[PDB]
């Protein structure tokens, strides 16, 4: 007889949260933004086209120095490209042929990979003895790996497909802090600029903010209608944008605990596969399933440009640290650089 | 200077490209197959013939390399990890034999998936003797679970079968027609189904898979030249 009062307490708390969000909301971001001038029409062409991958590309990560990037594809191959010269620096033959994600260490010493094997593997690149092998293999996850990001050379955060997020630490092989509370598969995650907060967009149409130091969630945002496929923090660190399968892009605020604006259009209905921000955060580059990527004015929710250069659907994209150029990866095994 | 760095980068690119060409020659010579099905379907018996996430089964026949990739360990929700198997030659489907309705719904979901439209699927009606004993015993019935069995007529036009209970032949062909109605209800001619009646100790399953893969490759090659 204790179920009913639990449900009533939950619904009362939900109503209280709704009332608090309504009280703190007085004017939308669009109303206060209309006075500034629009960005205007912009266009960027494919400066470099990268070819050599056999299968479709799922994820990539730009380097800290804006010189090298790593791409993962379904051929069991990891390629570290040179952006300026289109030269293959490394070619790591993966032991798993269904890798779904990759990561680049901030120092560039290590790389990460994950897929349909519940195992995250770390490979050493700075070692120079004619061999490149996996340093540490992380096992313990039940669901499939979806996205992994590097905190330091001795800490890595992985989001599996079993509604759990784990903070690993290399050279030991065991899980330090486990984050639980989600009800759907965690598709993507991003790290805050200060390397203290990280969000996770699950398949339950909600983004949940976690604390790495203590190990529990702080705020829940919801505000979406379908599974969130990608997420990325604002450069200021107090906001982030999410992309779902219902062809809408939404920007949240870490302080207002509510959505700020929705980016969408009537003529296009395609699930967003990747969301990234520029240096200033003015442009919201979001991928789509209609074989092209759209650039959205974050402040005005007005389309600024269209990037159609991929034969297949775009599955991964990301702006470099200095914002010099943006690279998007599609399912046609072709990597392109836009500037 | 930059001349030596550029030279070293060029030679490293050449070596990596040669290795990539070798791995492309190796990779294009094998066909990837996905083994999918519900629980208690007898697929584990085939797997054992020859926890982690994916169990690899490297088997070859007629000088052709096949790579079958069972995905049992992953969680029940398959919407986000089923999109990966869009480049496979075929998807092997095993049906346990209302457990039939769940398999029918899963097949319907797979058939009209946007990213799964290109791939064809192989249907394996495992546990045929279980169906035979179930229909012969009479303890259970299919009329309550399917209000079409009685009016359904055995397709005597094409039913070459060894001697057995004709009622179970009607049952097998009824299940086959139920699968085919969903398969051809929304088909666009881009993927087809290859049903097969197999037992739990059938050693000809590999031959059936080989024949289905040959048919799929032939159809794709014919379509590439606009003949089909």
């Amino acid at each position: 007889s204790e179920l009913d009062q639990l449900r009533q307490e939950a619904e009362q708390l939900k109503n209280q949260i709704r009332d608090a969000r309504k009280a703190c909301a007085d004017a939308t971001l669009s109303q206060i933004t209309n006075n500034i001038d629009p960005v205007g029409r912009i266009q960027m062409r494919t400066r470099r086209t990268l070819r050599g991958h056999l299968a479709k590309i799922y994820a990539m990560h730009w380097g800290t120095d804006s010189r090298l990037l790593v791409s993962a594809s379904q051929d069991g191959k990891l390629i570290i490209w040179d952006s300026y010269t289109t030269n293959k620096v490394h070619a790591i033959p993966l032991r798993s042929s269904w890798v779904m994600t990759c990561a680049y260490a901030p120092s560039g010493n290590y790389v990460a990979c994950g897929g349909l094997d519940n195992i995250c593997s770390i490979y050493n690149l700075k070692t120079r003895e004619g061999n490149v092998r996996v340093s540490r293999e992380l096992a313990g996850h039940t669901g499939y790996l979806s996205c992994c990001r590097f905190l330091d050379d001795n800490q890595i955060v992985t989001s599996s497909g079993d509604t759990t997020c784990a903070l690993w630490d290399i050279e030991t092989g065991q899980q330090t802090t486990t984050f639980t509370g989600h009800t759907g598969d965690v598709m993507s995650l991003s790290l805050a600029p200060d390397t203290r907060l990280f969000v996770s967009g699950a398949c339950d149409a909600s983004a949940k903010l976690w604390d790495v130091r203590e190990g529990m969630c702080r705020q829940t945002f919801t505000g979406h209608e379908s599974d969130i496929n990608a997420i990325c923090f604002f450069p200021n660190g107090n906001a982030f944008a999410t992309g779902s399968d219902d062809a809408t892009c939404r920007l949240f605020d870490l302080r207002a605990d509510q959505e700020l604006m929705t980016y969408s259009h009537d003529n296009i209905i395609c699930g967003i596969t990747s969301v990234s921000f520029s240096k200033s955060g003015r442009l919201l580059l979001a991928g789509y399933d209609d074989f092209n990527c759209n650039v959205w004015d974050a402040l005005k929710a007005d389309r600024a440009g269209v990037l159609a250069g991929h034969d297949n659907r775009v599955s991964c994209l990301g702006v470099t640290d200095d914002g010099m150029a943006v690279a998007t990866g599609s399912w046609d095994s072709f990597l392109k650089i836009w500037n | 200077d930059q001349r030596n760095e550029e030279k070293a980068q060029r030679e490293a690119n050449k070596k990596i490209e040669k290795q990539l060409q070798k791995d492309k020659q190796v990779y294009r010579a094998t066909h990837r197959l996905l083994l999918l099905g519900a629980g208690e379907s007898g697929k584990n018996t085939i797997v054992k013939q020859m926890t982690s996430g994916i169990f690899e089964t490297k088997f070859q026949v007629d000088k052709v390399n096949f790579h079958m990739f069972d995905v049992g360990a992953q969680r029940d929700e398959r919407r986000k990890w089923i999109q990966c198997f869009n480049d496979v030659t075929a998807i092997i489907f095993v049906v346990a034999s209302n457990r039939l309705q769940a398999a029918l719904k899963l097949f319907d979901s797979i058939w009209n998936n946007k990213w799964l439209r290109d791939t064809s699927v192989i249907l394996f009606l495992n546990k045929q003797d279980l169906l035979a004993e179930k229909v012969l015993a009479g303890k259970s019935k299919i009329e309550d679970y399917f209000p079409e069995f009685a009016r359904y007529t055995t397709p005597e036009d094409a039913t070459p079968e060894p001697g057995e209970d004709p009622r179970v032949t009607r049952a097998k062909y009824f299940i086959r027609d139920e699968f085919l109605r969903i398969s051809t209800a929304s088909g666009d001619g881009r993927h087809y189904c290859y049903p097969h009646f197999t037992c739990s100790v059938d050693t000809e399953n590999i031959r059936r898979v080989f024949n289905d893969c040959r048919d799929i490759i032939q159809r794709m090659h014919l379509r590439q030249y606009e003949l089909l």
Partner: nanobody, 128 residues
Framework: QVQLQESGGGLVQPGGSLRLSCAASGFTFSNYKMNWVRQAPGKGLEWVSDISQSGASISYTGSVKGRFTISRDNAKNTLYLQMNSLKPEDTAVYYC?????????????????????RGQGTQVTVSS
């Protein structure tokens, strides 16, 4: 946030008639497809019926084919399922399940044990 709550269901004699209505909220009802899910006590999850967008394609499982009627409308954002010809073998908990994706027909993982968009459900049981 999606929130599917159920109504109806009670201890009635077999062969009676009931009514279950789901008032959709937090999302647009027209774009998505809707399915019905039953949970038989002491057994696994089961699928009841589905209705396509704008009431175009309607299908039911074999156990309830020819008996049950499902109706939805986009204006009221409501989902109904007629209750009739009740038998003790039909005693189960019925949930309102939403399709994962808009403008799509595959509609995976309706039968999955842990579903985020599945309604809370109301118990329907016939006895004497």
């Amino acid at each position: 946030q999606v929130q599917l709550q159920e109504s109806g269901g009670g201890l009635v004699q077999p062969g009676g008639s009931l009514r279950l209505s789901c008032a959709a909220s937090g999302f647009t009802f027209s774009n998505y497809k809707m399915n019905w899910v039953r949970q038989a006590p002491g057994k696994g999850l089961e699928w009841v019926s589905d209705i396509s967008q704008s009431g175009a394609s309607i299908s039911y499982t074999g156990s309830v084919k020819g008996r049950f009627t499902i109706s939805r409308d986009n204006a009221k954002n409501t989902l109904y399922l007629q209750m009739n010809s009740l038998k003790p073998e039909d005693t189960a908990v019925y949930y309102c399940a939403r399709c994962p994706a808009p403008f799509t027909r595959d509609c995976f993982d309706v039968t999955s044990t842990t579903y985020a968009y599945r309604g809370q459900g109301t118990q329907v049981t016939v006895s004497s």
